[PDB]
């Protein structure tokens, strides 16, 4: 839906921390003198960035007044294997098992087979292609699969057809 100010504020808060403070909410928490949890709640969106924080943020972020309120949209412009376990490791974090097959820890500094990843992945319940890429830009995972799955096939074609058209009008 069309943006409320919290959207722009947070979006601007997010971009500041990336482009000025290295995309880590603690470094900005340190400069703004506020709890890194509150900072995290603003970035994640869990809490609406108030009017006063926005000014304190601008001070802390060395931005001129109300810059945070303004939408600046028109402002101008790694390894598979270790991530396979990094995903698996982050997925372990919820023993060394491995309940189905495996017994590869795994170090993940060696190339594993798609069958083993497929067998590993469904242990957690997730698919094997997840989470292969750190940037995530190549894909729309935003949409709920259930909502897309439920769409009549006729409505899918409209979605896919418009995508394909957008592709050709760019390059």
């Amino acid at each position: 839906a069309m943006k409320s100010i919290y959207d722009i504020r947070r979006k601007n808060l997010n971009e500041i921390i990336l482009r000025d403070f290295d995309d880590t909410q603690l470094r900005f928490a340190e400069r703004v003198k506020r709890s890194q949890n509150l900072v995290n709640r603003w970035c994640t969106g869990i809490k609406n960035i108030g009017p006063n924080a926005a000014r304190i943020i601008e001070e802390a972020a060395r931005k001129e007044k109300f810059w945070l309120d303004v939408d600046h949209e028109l402002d101008a412009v790694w390894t598979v294997e270790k991530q396979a376990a990094a995903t698996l490791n982050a997925w372990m974090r919820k023993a060394g098992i491995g309940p189905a097959t495996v017994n590869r820890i795994m170090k993940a500094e060696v190339s594993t087979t798609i069958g083993v990843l497929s067998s590993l992945a469904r242990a957690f319940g997730h698919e094997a292609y997840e989470m292969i890429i750190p940037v995530g830009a190549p894909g729309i995972i935003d949409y709920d699969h259930r909502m897309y799955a439920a769409l009549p096939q006729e409505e899918k074609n409209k979605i896919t057809s418009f995508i394909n058209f957008v592709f050709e009008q760019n390059k």
Partner: protein, 74 residues
């Protein structure tokens, strides 16, 4: 200048930095409360960003609609 700012190029130019955004920021320094004034300029500029994007968005859909109608006609 007056014609420039009245071109869409010129109204878009007012989004980031205009003399009025410069002007209003100086007045705030002296203890005058421009909350009312400043909150309006931001809205005005945000409508410029927002409506330009929508128009560009409608622009994409109309050429899609025109693309299909050609094939049915052509």
């Amino acid at each position: 200048f007056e014609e420039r700012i009245h071109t869409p190029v010129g109204v878009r130019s007012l989004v980031e930095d205009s003399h009025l955004m410069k002007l209003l920021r100086e007045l705030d320094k002296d203890g005058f409360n421009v909350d009312g004034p400043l909150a309006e300029l931001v809205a005005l500029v945000n409508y410029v960003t927002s409506s330009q994007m929508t128009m560009q968005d409608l622009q994409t859909h109309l050429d899609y609609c025109a693309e299909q109608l050609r094939k049915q006609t052509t």
